Each structure stands twice: as C-alpha cells, then as structure tokens.
C-alpha cells in the first residue's frame, strides 16, 4: 500500500542486561523531516569579508573572514546526544552506568511524500516525481559535523525537523597584524586570494551514488560498526597534592570542632621523604615528590595566525576560560514558546584544572622567604602590559602530563568524531567523547529533484524555472551502546542526579505546550585517579 | 507499481586496476533530460537557402544551401568526450595514462516523468500519456554525430539538459561559378532541384521497433563491444630532420655559453653518406636520405568551378590552417552566467610536428647550381597565375607512399569520441571528426519523442517530459613508463587557470580546453 | 679469476604492477667507487677548538 507505511515509527529505548554486568543500550529514534527545494541548483563559490567590523582596531577577535563552496544539497546529521535520549533515559545511563562503548549505528528512510504548491496557495502531490539521497559511505566527502553549529535533528520526538543546508570550506589566504585601542595607523588587513596548490572542489554526483527515492520505497544503511575506546562516564578529583601516602601525624585532634586541626610533629627542614629539588632540604606537601603532573598550564586567550587567518588555541581542561560555551535554539533546547539563543556554560567535574592566580616561580637559589626580585608572580607586567602577566605565556605540558577525555554534554553535545588524516594524531579531541579510530558513519545527503516547467532551455542566462515543491519525510536511527553497571565500593553515597524542588518544572511541558531540555552533568561519580 | 523508482544517479568514474598495468576506466554519466512535445507529429522535408547572401561576387564560402527532413523524433547523443570525465578525471587519464581503448558501452532511461500544463499556469501529471524511445540496433537510420554541431548531452551533472530534434540530409544538387569581388557580371549561381534516384526516406511504424514508457518503465540497451584500435595519448616530434644518425663533430664546442656553437669539420662536398640526389655532390642535412616522409603540404583556400559542387576540404594536421576551430555554447563550457548569444571560440594547436611550415617550402630545377639564380628557383614569393596572393603552396600536395601520419588528437570536452567507418569500398585511411572509428558498427541512436495527448497541426494537451538519462563508457588504458632522464610535460593548475575550474559567486561554471598527447614518443 | 667478470652494472627502475592499484618501484643504482689508500693507519683522536 502505497498511502500505508513503508516502515515503523520508533524511539523507544531498549534496555538488555548481558553477563559480568555488561548492558545492550539500542536508542532507537525517529523524526520527521520537512525540506525544501534548493534556493539555487548550482554550487557557489561564496567569499565573506567583515573588514568593516575587523577594520576597527582591537576588533582581532571577529575575524568571520573566510571562503565557502554553498552546494544546492542539505545534511541530515543525527550526530548529538539529544537525538537519540531524552532526560529521563540520561539520567538513568549517568546514575547507573560507569563506562560507556559506542557499538554500532544504522539509518533508514521511510515514509516519504512530495509535494507541490500552485497558485490563494494550493498544494498538491507529485508521485512522479523523486527525491535524491546518498550516503558517502567512502568518507570521500569533508567531515562537517552540525552539533558545532547547533543545526542537528531536532531533539523533541514529536515536532518536524529541518536539515542543515550543506556547506563546506574552500581554501584562502589571510593576514590580519594585530593591534591595540589607540594603535597609531590602519594595521595591515587584507584578503590574498587561494593558492593553486590547495583548490579542492568537490561534488557530491561526482563522488558517492544518488538513490533516486519516490513514494513507496526506502533507502536503508547497512549498519555501521565503531570500535571507539570507552568513555568514563565518573570524574578524577585527586589533583597532584592527593596523591601518594599523606605524612604522619603526631598530634592527632584531642576534640571534636571544626578549629582543632592536626598538626605534623617534624619540622620541615628536618622530615623525611623524596624532593625534586637537589639544593632544597625542607620536605613540604608543595615540595614533595609525585609519580607525574596531572593537568597542565596553557597559553589561556592566546590567537596564533597561520594561512587562513588567527584563530583561538584551544585548551583540554579549564578550572571561565576552558569550559565549554553552548549556543543553541528551540530545536535544541531553548524553550521553545518563547519569542537571542539560550546558554549555559559547562562547569564540568572533571577537575585537572588550574588557578593561575595562585602559580608562581621563584629563584633556583630557594632563598625561602623569598625576596621581590626573585620571585615572578602573575600580578607583575609582562612586556609592561598590566594586564598580562605570566601565565598568558606559560605552557607547563610534558612526558609527565596525564589528562582526562572531555566529558559528555547532554543535550547539544556532540557524540563522535572524525580522526585525523594527519601522521602524527592528538591525544584528544576536545568536542566528542569518542573518536573514530578509521572511518566514522557516512554523512547522509538529501535533495529535492529539479521540477521543471516547460519553459526550460539550458542557453538562458537566468536561473532555471523550476516549479515551487517540497518533500516531506521521515527519518529513523538506530544506535547501540554498551556499558558497565556501577558498583559501590564507597561506603558514602555519590552525588547521583535526581528531580528536585527548583529544577522540576523544567521537565514538564507549560500549559502552552512549550519544552525545555536542561544541561545535564555526565561524569557524577568520583574516581580513583592511582 | 507507479510509485517505486526504477534506477540510481551515478556519475562516478572508477579505477580498476589489472595485471600488466593496465587499468579498466569504467566512466558512470548520467544526467537529467528535457523535452518539450514536438511543434508537430509529422516529418517535413525543406530546402533552406541564403541566395540573397551569396548573390554577392566574391562570398563563395557563405554558400549554405542544403535540403533536409525534419522530424518529430529528437536525438540523445552522449558521444562526446566532456560528457563522461570531469577536469580532474580527464588530468588523471592524460598524465598517467599512454594508450588508450574503448571497450562497451550502455545507455539506459529510467525514473520517465510526463507533465501537462493549463492555463496563470497549473502543472499536472499525465500517467494515461507515455514516453515514445527507439532505438536503433541495426544502424539503419543515417548517423548525426551530433558533437559536430556541439549538441550533444550537457557536460555538468548538476545542470537538467535538452536532446537536439533531429534532422537529416535530403538529397540536392546545385552549382556556382566563383568569382571575386568586382567581378563585371553576376556569376551562374543557380539551385537545380533534387535527383530523385538518390531520394530516401525513412518510415518507422513496422519496420523499425518501438517502445512506450509510463511513469515506472525502463529502458535498457544492452552493453555493446567496440572493435577500435587504441588512440594513443602521445605526440611525436620527430620530423625528417631529426631521423637517422646525426654527423659525427669533428670540432666540439669550449668554454660554454649560447654563442659557442659546434662546428662539422668536413667540407660540404667531401662528405660521406648517401642522397636521393643522383647528380649532385653535397651531402647536407636537407639533402641527405631519410627512410620516409611524415606528414604532407596539401592546399588550402581557393577554388575553382568544376563538377564536384561546394566542398571545405580537409586536412590531417597543421602547423592558421589545418588546426580544427571549436565554438560551442553554455551547455558544453562557456561560461554559463554569461549574457548575450556570443559562442566561445578555441583553436586545438596540437602538438604534434607533423603539420607544415609553408613559407619555408620551395622548388629549384634539375640541373641544381648552388647559388641559384631568379629564374631557376620557384619561392612562396612568387605569384602563381599573375595573381599576388596566391603561391605555389597553396595548391600543392606531397601526399604520396612515403608519408606517415598520427591520428587526430582527442580534444576535451567538445571532441567526438567515436565515429562510423563508411560504406565504400575503399575506406578513409583516418578521420578528421573523433580520434575512435568502429569498423563494422557502433550503436544507432537512440530516439525519442513525446506521443500525442489528444482529447480524450493536430489538437494535443501542452506537455513535456522529463527523464533522467544514464551511461556507462568503459575503456582500458595502459600506464606510463619513464624512459628519458628528463621530466615531461603535464596538466597541472597554476595562479593564471585557478578560477577556470571552480564555480563563480553567483554559481556560474565553465569548462575550458585541455591538450590530449602531452607526452613525448620516440617516432624512429 | 683475475679475468672474469663478477657483476653487472644496472641502474634501471622497474614498475610492477600488482593487483588492488599497488605499484613496486625496484630502484636499481650502480656507481664506481674510487678509493685512495688512508692518511694515516692508526686511530686519532682530535679536538677541534674555534
């Protein structure tokens, strides 16, 4: 039957308990897509340059100066935790659950209906008609993921949904000079051009199949298989002063009170231990030898230039700098009755962080109360800039560094992503918890077919006349995790995650039928770091 | 079922790879095609004629008359070299490929659409209606490259493209007297009409097969074979100076530089070899024997009235003259933003050394006296018929059994790929048109037209189709060797051609020429 | 012996083509190599003091 469905709807998640605590999670999920037929049916070369709101000086940070290919295609991109599990399911994975393996994913398209408007607006169907699809199974295409700019698959099950118009970047050339409020002349600004060397224009008829779909058939993915090492979904606390054996007291507390502290018997020039200071005798929790450096200092707001432009260095950890910024819309979490995007900032648990108003370097000498002359601290001038001090300079990275996997964000975070094509790889990337080791899941590609009229004729200059249509269809996925259940070696509760009195009307939809999805942490638990 | 699609938009050249370094090009075309119901359902046989503007004495060239059918069925022609490999599959082929195959070839038609418009205007389906496709396996019907005419299907995937309605060639016969301009009379410049024992016309209804589409059928031709020789993707240099052991130096050149040239120590009379000049003692590099002659002089514009009637003839190859002179339109490279009605124009400077250099030919007589004298020499200076524009070149030919020639280059993307050897009995030793020609048969053309939507010239609904057309080209191909010490010549983009091959701001395309033989071959 | 030859010279590249578009490039390379007697036999050792 054609106008009987072609598959089912689903979003149903299943839950399946396997052996030695091992648990099958299949976040099954479905949305209906609207699109509508391309602006234009050509690719276009499109070059954007703001030298009015660059050309300021001290505006180095709004550089958007770049070049683009707009294809007449759109991307259905399913890539973000929001899509596939609603609050209630993350909240039992995050409280139960300690690891996570991202397993194996599929697509399908069903359901899908074409149609035309005439002209008040009378719309009619079109069976004759197609739409186009292609999956880049290859990954010949660039990795573009939309859960960088919020443009995913809507997250409510129940509204339609929208696809990104696709587009990806075509190489330029760029230089910006730097300079300061009150610079004496115009710094140096301008666009080159690109260079022959770098030109990469693809297309998509050209590089992966187009399946011409009509009503009563579907397009399906054979499933994809990852092998992506676990995500932990429990945080390290232990900075480098909590690790190791602590020193023995001599005077425990011979009262109850919160002012009754301990005190070390030995004084510190006279203790015992290992320091990593040759000409040091004093032993102190500060001086004191640890296996290795967890965290590490960075350059914070430092712009580096290359080729195409000054960009921000970004940083694996934060203790505002660091942690993560969202920007989103009513697809993806603001509230959707309401009539400027919705932020938060994700102030994680996961620590290795660092306080740079506490760091300081001090004379190899060690002349303990040590002189103004030899110590640096982060309130003396760099270069003679009050505002700049150190630590806007100081890199601290090393053999000894040891760093945690960024965390999980629940709903506009981003589930996987693309390795490097480079030969020598990074450790981590710093917006997917997880990371193809090879080949990520193909991007799926969609496109209204052309509707011409009988006016067409290839030799006029003018956009080709195409008759007004849009395409409605329904899309499913189906994702499979795997993970270990939790155990409570602690003897004290975790800070599990739960409804309350504040955050409870947040859940439930208003009497208007409006919605939120609120933030949600991901690694609650704490964890050993040794 | 009407509903369920019937096929897949590919558009991928492929690279398989066989022993011996050969590798299989398996070209996947596929586009888009257009196509307005016919201005009527029936043939129509006309003579068409521009005696007012070659009345003028002098315009011989303008000559256009000719006599043809026209007909309701309109041609879908893949057969041209831009429609199956893009910029960079072709730079893949020309760089590292050395010879060249073809090997099969398909066409099929699938995903048939059928709109009918009424009056503002609404557009509705029409299932009751069917598409009308013939194609023929037999090569009966006359053959219409139509690349010759640059008409063929649209180069860019993304761009929907139209079929060219097809015509052929009604029989005729005329006359003119040329005669230059200030002639003191009109010339003989008269039309006479048609022979009617070489009439031939060419009926379809049970003699020719036939098939109808609505929205769900398909149409498949099966894969042909071709039987081609290889065009090779290789230019040689070698001309009749450069054959043969060159002259042992006696005095080697020092000290470096431009200036510091090497010197023959022999005199010109006392040298040793061999010369195809019976009488005359001087052995030089011009006159010394080589095994045979590459290329040929031929003539070139000018006539004179005989029985033959209008002809432009043709030549193999050329140092302009000899060089073909493309011009095409948005469909197939200019640039498709463009306004106006202009065609962009090339010339295909080929790189081979076979053509004709004519301002340095000459003749001197039998007796060969060596500073020779005005009258025993004949130049390119010299008027032939008193007239001041015209030399002894201009009407010769060195065509004779010593010559040796290359095929035509291919050209991309405008060239014609294939082509049909002719009927007589001694064939044409190349052709001009496509660098491929099948010996017994390549397929017909495919046919198609849009059948009568009458109620329920004659009384029809206003209706068109769509349908998207997809091929399959395979050829075979070896790869290259290094043999020299010194690199070649290949494609490659730089800072002048970087915009050539990227789309514009405003989404315009173009697709500019690229040469075929790059390489150097060692000839003898 | 002292008259026969015990080699060949060769400085050809050879490409073999495999199957699955793999390509083995065999870099042949000859060079005669002329050698003079040392400066001196015994080991030296040498500080060099700018």
């Given at each position: 039957?054609?106008?009987?469905?072609?598959?089912?709807?689903?979003?149903?998640?299943?839950?399946?308990?396997?052996?030695?605590?091992?648990?099958?999670?299949?976040?099954?999920?479905?949305?209906?897509?609207?699109?509508?037929?391309?602006?234009?049916?050509?690719?276009?070369?499109?070059?954007?340059?703001?030298?009015?709101?660059?050309?300021?000086?001290?505006?180095?940070?709004?550089?958007?100066?770049?070049?683009?290919?707009?294809?007449?295609?759109?991307?259905?991109?399913?890539?973000?935790?929001?899509?596939?599990?609603?609050?209630?399911?993350?909240?039992?994975?995050?409280?139960?659950?300690?690891?996570?393996?991202?397993?194996?994913?599929?697509?399908?398209?069903?359901?899908?209906?074409?149609?035309?408007?005439?002209?008040?607006?009378?719309?009619?169907?079109?069976?004759?008609?197609?739409?186009?699809?292609?999956?880049?199974?290859?990954?010949?295409?660039?990795?573009?993921?939309?859960?960088?700019?919020?443009?995913?698959?809507?997250?409510?099950?129940?509204?339609?949904?929208?696809?990104?118009?696709?587009?990806?970047?075509?190489?330029?050339?760029?230089?910006?000079?730097?300079?300061?409020?009150?610079?004496?002349?115009?710094?140096?600004?301008?666009?080159?051009?690109?260079?022959?060397?770098?030109?990469?224009?693809?297309?998509?008829?050209?590089?992966?199949?187009?399946?011409?779909?009509?009503?009563?058939?579907?397009?399906?993915?054979?499933?994809?298989?990852?092998?992506?090492?676990?995500?932990?979904?429990?945080?390290?606390?232990?900075?480098?002063?909590?690790?190791?054996?602590?020193?023995?007291?001599?005077?425990?507390?011979?009262?109850?009170?919160?002012?009754?502290?301990?005190?070390?018997?030995?004084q510190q020039d006279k203790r015992r231990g290992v320091t990593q200071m040759g000409?040091?005798?004093?032993?102190?929790?500060?001086?004191?030898?640890?296996?290795?450096?967890?965290?590490?200092?960075?350059?914070?707001?430092?712009?580096?230039?290359?080729?195409?432009?000054?960009?921000?260095?970004?940083?694996?950890?934060?203790?505002?700098?660091?942690?993560?910024?969202?920007?989103?819309?009513?697809?993806?979490?603001?509230?959707?009755?309401?009539?400027?995007?919705?932020?938060?900032?994700?102030?994680?648990?996961?620590?290795?962080?660092?306080?740079?108003?506490?760091?300081?370097?001090?004379?190899?000498?060690?002349?303990?109360?040590?002189?103004?002359?030899?110590?640096?601290?982060?309130?003396?001038?760099?270069?003679?800039?009050?505002?700049?001090?150190?630590?806007?300079?100081?890199?601290?990275?090393?053999?000894?560094?040891?760093?945690?996997?960024?965390?999980?964000?629940?709903?506009?975070?981003?589930?996987?992503?693309?390795?490097?094509?480079?030969?020598?790889?990074?450790?981590?990337?710093?917006?997917?918890?997880?990371?193809?080791?090879?080949?990520?899941?193909?991007?799926?590609?969609?496109?209204?077919?052309?509707?011409?009229?009988?006016?067409?004729?290839?030799?006029?200059?003018?956009?080709?006349?195409?008759?007004?249509?849009?395409?409605?269809?329904?899309?499913?996925?189906?994702?499979?995790?795997?993970?270990?259940?939790?155990?409570?070696?602690?003897?004290?509760?975790?800070?599990?995650?739960?409804?309350?009195?504040?955050?409870?009307?947040?859940?439930?939809?208003?009497?208007?039928?409006?919605?939120?999805?609120?933030?949600?942490?991901?690694?609650?638990?704490?964890?050993?770091?040794?």
């Amino acid at each position: 039957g054609v106008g009987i469905s072609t598959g089912t709807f689903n979003n149903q998640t299943e839950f399946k308990f396997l052996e030695n605590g091992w648990v099958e999670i299949t976040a099954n999920s479905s949305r209906l897509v609207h699109l509508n037929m391309p602006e234009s049916e050509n690719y276009r070369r499109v070059v954007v340059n703001n030298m009015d709101k660059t050309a300021v000086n001290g505006n180095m940070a709004l550089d958007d100066i770049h070049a683009q290919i707009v294809t007449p295609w759109s991307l259905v991109d399913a890539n973000a935790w929001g899509v596939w599990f609603n609050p209630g399911d993350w909240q039992l994975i995050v409280n139960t659950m300690s690891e996570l393996h991202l397993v194996s994913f599929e697509q399908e398209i069903f359901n899908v209906v074409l149609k035309t408007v005439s002209e008040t607006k009378v719309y009619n169907n079109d069976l004759t008609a197609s739409l186009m699809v292609a999956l880049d199974s290859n990954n010949t295409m660039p990795f573009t993921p939309a859960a960088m700019r919020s443009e995913t698959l809507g997250f409510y099950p129940w509204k339609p949904t929208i696809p990104t118009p696709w587009r990806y970047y075509f190489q330029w050339d760029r230089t910006l000079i730097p300079s300061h409020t009150g610079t004496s002349g115009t710094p140096t600004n301008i666009y080159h051009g690109t260079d022959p060397d770098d030109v990469q224009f693809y297309t998509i008829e050209n590089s992966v199949p187009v399946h011409l779909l009509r009503t009563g058939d579907e397009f399906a993915t054979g499933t994809f298989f990852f092998d992506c090492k676990p995500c932990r979904l429990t945080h390290t606390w232990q900075t480098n002063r909590a690790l190791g054996l602590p020193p023995f007291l001599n005077s425990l507390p011979q009262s109850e009170g919160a002012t009754n502290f301990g005190d070390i018997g030995v004084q510190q020039d006279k203790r015992r231990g290992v320091t990593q200071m040759g000409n040091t005798n004093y032993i102190t929790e500060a001086t004191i030898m640890r296996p290795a450096e967890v965290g590490y200092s960075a350059p914070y707001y430092s712009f580096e230039a290359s080729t195409q432009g000054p960009f921000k260095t970004p940083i694996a950890a934060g203790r505002a700098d660091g942690n993560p910024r969202y920007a989103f819309g009513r697809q993806h979490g603001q509230k959707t009755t309401t009539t400027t995007p919705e932020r938060f900032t994700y102030i994680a648990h996961q620590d290795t962080g660092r306080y740079p108003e506490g760091d300081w370097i001090q004379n190899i000498n060690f002349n303990l109360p040590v002189t103004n002359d030899n110590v640096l601290l982060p309130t003396d001038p760099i270069g003679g800039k009050t505002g700049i001090n150190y630590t806007n300079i100081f890199n601290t990275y090393g053999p000894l560094t040891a760093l945690n996997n960024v965390p999980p964000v629940y709903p506009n975070g981003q589930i996987w992503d693309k390795e490097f094509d480079t030969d020598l790889k990074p450790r981590l990337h710093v917006n997917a918890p997880f990371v193809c080791q090879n080949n990520c899941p193909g991007q799926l590609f969609v496109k209204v077919a052309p509707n011409l009229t009988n006016e067409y004729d290839p030799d006029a200059s003018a956009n080709m006349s195409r008759i007004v249509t849009y395409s409605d269809f329904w899309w499913k996925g189906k994702l499979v995790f795997k993970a270990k259940l939790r155990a409570s070696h602690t003897w004290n509760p975790i800070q599990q995650m739960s409804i309350n009195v504040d955050n409870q009307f947040n859940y439930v939809p208003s009497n208007i039928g409006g919605m939120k999805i609120v933030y949600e942490k991901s690694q609650l638990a704490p964890r050993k770091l040794y």
